[PDB]
């Protein structure tokens, strides 16, 4: 509720903005528009680029590196919007910055923002 | 952990499409929803006031749409796009030169498919009335057909369609791939003081046109013979109800279930000139006899309704103000699930008659 | 409030949907986006065609013919939206129909909808 | 009634522009508002994540924008459009070859005008950092300048601008000695662990760059000599407030009033990683001494602030969530008027320094 309070992750609802893997998401959760936690919805294009963050998983006690890739080539879904910024740095430290549209690498040169997925790319240690 | 692009589930009787004209915005969206799970399975982007169509056999979906080179000004381009129903990728993009689309709040029957799925017809209002012919199979715009002061397009065959004329008749239009169309008129079927709503229900497979008036009187026309047979009118509200202020009202006010031969109509108590406001009730009636089978209290302000065409159908009730599609059991009227966050001002529900 | 109740006009706030002149407007009031009760906002294009309605003026107890012309060539304002339908008829009686985008005749062939004005064109009764 | 098209009032110090990036939607809007009256005086349509600029002399307004041929896919066109500030008609539309714009949530200093109003510079991030040069007076794109790993663009003259580099230094780019720019770096002004926000305030007329860090520490750089002079950093919040959880947070977090030489910072009590949430307070401080002049309770969740540049300024406070611009007296902090219904997710306020 208190938007300014420390973020507390949960592991029970992937469409909620407090889902653990969404610790540095900026945009919309793809699961809400036909994609899934780690796959893009039909019709969109999957970028290869991403901003990353280390998110804590409450269920197992570890932290994991999440690579936020965008699904591009469509107007914003408008469903399940969220903006979290755990460990998010300014634009001059792009690897960790989340206002940038991380669509590079998508097919057909797609650069419009539809939603973001939250795949795990490694442990954080 | 390996990201990919998903494919939507195969189209089935429970798939439902919701279009969001977004209160006249320059760009719009279409939501593809699995009615069974109550989940969004895909989306499609569209331009200004697009007209959606969906093949009854589930082989494809398409829309007639309009974009501008500078958002809402600059060069205009009208076009048709056809999409695969599982990958959601466009399979054709056909330009309609010379900006012929009629831009109006979305009426489903202003753009329609012939029974074979090979041709798309759309209405032009200005400079003069006409109907454009798009060949989906050949992927090309063929031509404009000149018609009299008539509206809406109900295709009955690969080369024939009906329109409703200002004079109260229906116009039968037989086109015939080169030439000038043979235009025939039926008898006048309604007086000048009966106003037929902008959203009649039409079942192409059944050839049944269900058209209500502002008062709930329902005209039914059977086109299955290739010709119009007028059926006996039916009153959806009783005299006492009307005396009590009951009237239909909404956007897609009526729905028709083919296999059950049943009509669903949105109604509520309202002043006579409040015909576009949402309604909280739905009356269900037998199409053969006019007999009332049920009156459901929907429990929300519903603007549009539609039904699945399967054996035990779902009743879809879309609220523009809540931006949510409520899914109900069409037999009991009970609310099963709901899908929210449907855009800015969702208004049109489309379903396929796959049976 | 009860959207289904009979419309009741007022003659004091032009930006409200119950203002007497807006009896059959469908869209957005231009006064709310830089236009005025009878003029188009800067940058838009004024249509020549329109749909009309006879609206009752509570102040003087007379009805006037309002010709709803659209201001076009811009995306919808999104401010002061309203939909009233006093005397509104189906599309086959177009002169009285309000779902139609009344942009015909605007310069530059503008056809996108921005807002609608409510000019008086004569008396009614 | 004789309808016509209005002209906006002449630009003045009280005019304020609000941009709505609409939560990354494919099309956006800009609202032109008279701050004295609290009235919308006009609008401008834009594409995907456009960057707005306003000439300080009030002679024109412009933006760098992006459109696609099929709403959000198809061919991309990046372009600059210039508009007359009274008629709001476009006076130039200049295509930027090869889609070079950087698409990112709107940072005002990612697209900027030179002090003479003749050149527009915009940033490109990928494949590699570069700055594009647009000749507004001749209506053509001129070229791209390669630059090091630096960000933001602060123009100091017709052929010179500064950028902030990943290493903590500023880079001075002198161009217009065609071929290759002269690039010089200042010394490093901040450590690797002090994070400078994405929205510094910069007054081109005074040559003053005000740049807060995540903790409210403020760096000031004087660029009036044409070279960078660093000032000692000021803390906006006391040790007590900091120990108590106070930190800046929002989008356009800081504003700078030139004639009064005052800094305004949005702050609130928050966790350290909630730097982009709205704030409910504003601290005002003297730029010369670092002394606190006031702390205002805004009474709403504010995301962005800006000020008019006249001698008795208004403080603009924009709430993305309420979609409303609250207009306050910059001196007393008191709320005067508000303007609601400002699009879908408005975030950027721009004012001209006409004095």
DSSP D321: T
CA angle B229, B234, B240 (to 5 degrees): 165
Taking Cα atoms as reference points, which of C89, D20, D326 lies closest to residue B25? D20
Inspect the interface and report whether the beta carbons of A112 and D151 lie closer than 8 Å. no
Candidates B348, B349, B251, B344; CA nearest to B27 is B344
Helix (H, G, I), strand (E, B), or coil: what is residue C107? Answer: helix
- Touching partners of C (3+ C-beta pairs < 8 Å): B, D
d(CA B46, nearest CA chain A) in Å: 10
Asked if B123 and B134 touch (Cβ cutoff 8 Å), the reply is no
Q: Do chains B and C touch (3 or more CB pairs under 8 A)?
A: yes
- Residues of chain B with Cβ-Cβ distance to D47 below 8 Å are 71
Nearest CB neighbour to C75, from listed B71, B76, B125: B71
Which residues does D168 contact at the CB level (< 8 Å), separation at least 6? D188, D189, D190, D191, D192
Q: Give the distance between the most distant pair of CA atoms in chain B.
A: 67
Contact A3 D72 (CB under 8 A): no
Question: B137 with B154: CB under 8 angstroms?
Answer: no
Rounded Cα–Cα distance for residues B339 and B138 (Å):
37
Q: Which of C36, C43, C46 sits opposite D87 (nearest CB)?
A: C43
Residue with tokens 């499409």: B17
Structure tokens at B129: 């009335």
| H-run or E-run covering D235 | strand D234-235
Smallest CA–CA separation between B42 and chain A, in Å? Answer: 5
In this structure, are residues A121 and A66 in contact, taking their beta carbons and an 8 Å threshold? yes
Give me the residue spans of the domains in chain A: 1-125
What span, in angstroms and rounded, lies between the C-alpha atoms of D281 and D295?
A: 7
Asked if B48 is an active-site residue, the reply is yes
Tell me the shortest Cα–Cα distance from D165 to chain A, in angstroms. 7
Beta strand D229-230 pairing with D217-222: antiparallel
**Which sequence spans correspond to the domains of chain D?**
1-355
Chain B interface mutation, best of A14, A43, A102, A113, highest count of B Cβ atoms under 10 Å: A43
Count chain B–chain D contacts defined by CB atoms under 8 A. Answer: 32
Q: Per the CB < 8 Å rule, is B195 touching C90? A: yes
- Closest-CA residue to D137 (of D111, D119, D113): D119
Q: What does the alpha-carbon distance between residue D8 and residue B4 come to, in Å, rounded to a whole number? A: 50
User: Of D31, D56, D52, D49, which Cα lies nearest the Cα of D204?
Assistant: D56
Q: For residue B183, give Cα distances in angstroms to B160, B186, D195.
A: 10, 10, 74
Task: Name chain B contacts of A122, Cβ cutoff 8 Å.
Answer: none
Is C15:C93 a contact under the CB 8 Å cutoff?
no
> Which ranges in chain D belong to alpha helices (H)?
239-243
Interface test with D, best of A70, A75, A84 (most D CBs within 10 A): A75
Please state which of the four CATH numbers 1.25.40.340, 3.90.180.10, 2.130.10.10, 2.40.110.10 is assigned to the domain occupying B1-355. 2.130.10.10
How is residue B233 annotated by DSSP?
A: P
Q: Which of B67, B72, B73 sits opposite D71 (nearest CB)?
A: B67
Q: Using an 8 Å Cβ cutoff, are B187 and B336 in contact?
A: no
D contact chains, 3+ CB pairs < 8 A: A, B, C
Scanning D62-152, the segments in alpha helix (DSSP H) are none
Pair B148, B171: CB distance under 8 Å: yes
Would you give the end-to-end CA distance of chain A in angstroms? 31
Task: Show the tokens assigned to D320.
Answer: 């993305």
CA–CA distance from B11 to each of B1, B53, B257, C25, D182 (Å)? 28, 14, 19, 40, 61
Query: If you count them, how many residues does chain C have?
Result: 125
Q: Which residues of B touch C5 (CB under 8 A)?
A: 270-271, 274
The Cα of B108 is separated from the nearest Cα of chain C by a number of Å equal to 13
Give chain C's end-to-end CA distance (angstroms, integer): 29
* Residue in D closest to A23 by C-alpha: D273
Asked whether the beta carbons of C92 and B282 are under 8 A apart, the reply is no
CB atoms within 10 A of CB B164: 26
- Catalytic option among D31, D48, D83, D162: D48
> What residues pair up with D182 in beta bridges, in sequence order?
D174
Q: Is residue B169 within 8 Å of residue B149, measured between CB atoms?
A: no
SS percent in chain C: helix, strand, coil, step 5: 10, 30, 60
Closest partner CB to A81 (pick from D23, D73, D274):
D23
- Quote the CATH superfamily of domain C1-125: Methylamine/Aralkylamine dehydrogenase light chain (2.60.30.10)
Compute φ and ψ for B232, nearest 5 degrees.
-65, 130
Per-residue b/e over B298-327, b at no fewer than 16 CB within 10 Å? bebbbbbbbbbbbeebbbbbbbbebbbbbb
Please give the distance of CA D173 from its chain centroid, rounded to a whole number.
20
Q: Which of 136-175 (B) contact C at CB < 8 A? A: 150-151, 164-166
Catalytic residue among A60, A70, A102, A108: A70
Among A34, A38, A120, the residue with its CB nearest the CB of B42 is A34
Smallest CA-to-CA distance from D120 within D32, D50, D46, D224 is with D50
Beta-carbon separation of C4 and B270 below 8 A: yes
Interatomic CA distance for residues C22 and C18, integer angstroms: 7
- Rounded to the nearest 5 degrees, what angle is found at the Cα of B88, between the Cα atoms of B349 and A31? 80
Contact call for residues B221 and B156 (beta carbons, < 8 A): no
Q: Which of D25, D67, D95 would you mutate first to test chain B, the one with the most B CBs within 10 A?
A: D67
Task: Tell me, in Å, the resolution of the deposited structure.
Answer: 1.8
Chain C within 8 Å of D47 (Cβ-Cβ)?
no
Q: Edge to edge, what strands does the sheet with C70-72 contain?
A: C45-46, C70-72, C113-116
Q: What residue ranges in B158-253 does DSSP mark as E strands? A: 160-165, 170-174, 182-185, 201-203, 208-212, 217-222, 229-230, 234-235, 246-248
**Distance (Å, rounded) from C-alpha B44 to C-alpha B22?**
14
List the end-to-end C-alpha distance of chain B, in Å, as a whole number: 40
Which residues 6+ apart lie within 8 Å of D201 measured at CB?
D209, D210, D211, D254, D255, D256, D263
Classified as helix, coil or strand, C96 is: helix
Whether residue B166 and residue C108 make contact (CB cut-off 8 A), yes or no, is no
The reply to whether B125 touches chain C by the CB within 8 Å rule is yes
Whether the CB-CB separation of B49 and B104 falls below 8 Å is answered with yes
Structural contact between residues B313 and B261, judged by C-beta atoms closer than 8 angstroms = no
Output the CA–CA distances (angstroms, integers) from residue B86 to A47, B5, B167, in the order listed: 21, 12, 44
Testing the interface with B: which of A34, A81, A82 to mutate, by most B Cβ within 10 A? A34
Q: Does A touch D (3+ CB pairs < 8 Å)?
A: yes
**D164, containing H or E segment:** strand D160-165
Q: Do D43 and C32 touch (CB under 8 A)?
A: no
Nearest to C25 by CA among C82, C90, C78: C82
Partners of C82 in the β-ladder: C27
CA nearest neighbour of C48 among C103, C108, C118, C121: C103
How far is Cα of residue B282 from the mean position of the Cα atoms in its chain? 18
- Distance from the Cα of residue A5 to its chain's centroid: 20
- Min Cα distance B216 → chain D (Å) is 37
Q: Closest-CA residue in chain B for D65?
A: B70
Q: From CA B316, how far away is CA B334, in angstroms rounded?
A: 11
Chain CA centroid to CA B53, Å: 8
């Amino acid at each position: 509720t208190d938007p300014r309070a420390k973020w507390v992750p949960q592991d029970n609802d992937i469409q909620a903005c407090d889902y653990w893997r969404h610790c540095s998401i900026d945009g919309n959760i793809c699961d809400c528009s036909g994609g899934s936690l780690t796959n893009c919805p039909p019709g969109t294009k999957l970028a290869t680029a991403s901003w990353v963050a280390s998110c804590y998983n409450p269920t197992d006690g570890q932290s994991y590196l999440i690579a936020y890739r965008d699904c591009c080539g469509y107007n914003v879904s408008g469903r399940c919007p969220c903006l979290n910024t755990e460990g998010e740095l300014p634009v001059y430290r792009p690897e960790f910055a989340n206002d940038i549209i991380w669509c590079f690498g998508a097919e057909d040169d797609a650069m419009t923002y539809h939603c973001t997925i939250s795949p795990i790319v490694g442990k954080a240690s | 952990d390996e990201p990919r692009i998903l494919e939507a589930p195969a189209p089935d009787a429970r798939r439902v499409y919701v279009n969001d004209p977004a209160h006249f915005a320059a760009v719009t969206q279409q939501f593809v929803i699995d009615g069974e799970a109550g989940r969004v399975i895909g989306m499609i982007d569209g331009g200004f006031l697009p007209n959606p169509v969906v093949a009854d056999d589930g082989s494809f979906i398409a829309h007639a749409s309009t974009v501008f080179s500078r958002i809402a000004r600059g060069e205009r381009t009208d076009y048709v796009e056809v999409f695969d129903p599982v990958t959601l990728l466009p399979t054709a993009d056909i330009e309609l030169p010379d900006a012929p689309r009629f831009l109006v709040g979305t009426y489903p029957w202003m753009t329609s498919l012939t029974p074979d799925g090979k041709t798309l017809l759309f209405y032009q209002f200005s400079p003069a009335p006409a109907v454009g012919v798009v060949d989906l199979e050949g992927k090309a715009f063929k031509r404009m057909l000149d018609v009299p002061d008539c509206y809406h397009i109900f295709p009955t065959a690969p080369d024939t369609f009906f329109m409703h004329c200002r004079d109260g008749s229906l116009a039968k239009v037989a086109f015939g791939t080169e030439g000038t169309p043979e235009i025939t008129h039926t008898e006048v079927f309604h007086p000048e003081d009966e106003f037929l709503i902008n959203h009649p229900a039409y079942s192409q497979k059944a050839g049944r046109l269900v058209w209500p008036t502002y008062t709930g009187k329902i005209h039914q026309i059977d086109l299955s013979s290739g010709d119009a047979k007028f059926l006996p009118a039916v009153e959806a509200l009783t005299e006492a109800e009307r005396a009590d202020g009951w009237r239909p009202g909404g956007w897609q006010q009526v729905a028709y279930h083919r296999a059950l031969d049943r009509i669903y109509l949105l109604v509520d108590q309202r002043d006579e000139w409040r015909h576009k406001t949402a309604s909280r009730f739905v009356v269900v009636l037998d199409a053969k006899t006019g007999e009332r089978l049920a009156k459901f209290e929907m429990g929300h302000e519903i603007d549009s309704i539609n039904v699945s065409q399967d054996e035990k159908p779902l009743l879809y009730a879309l609220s523009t103000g809540d931006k949510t599609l409520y899914i109900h059991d069409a037999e009991s009227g009970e609310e099963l699930r709901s899908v929210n966050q449907l855009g800015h001002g969702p208004q049109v529900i489309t379903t396929a008659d796959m049976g």
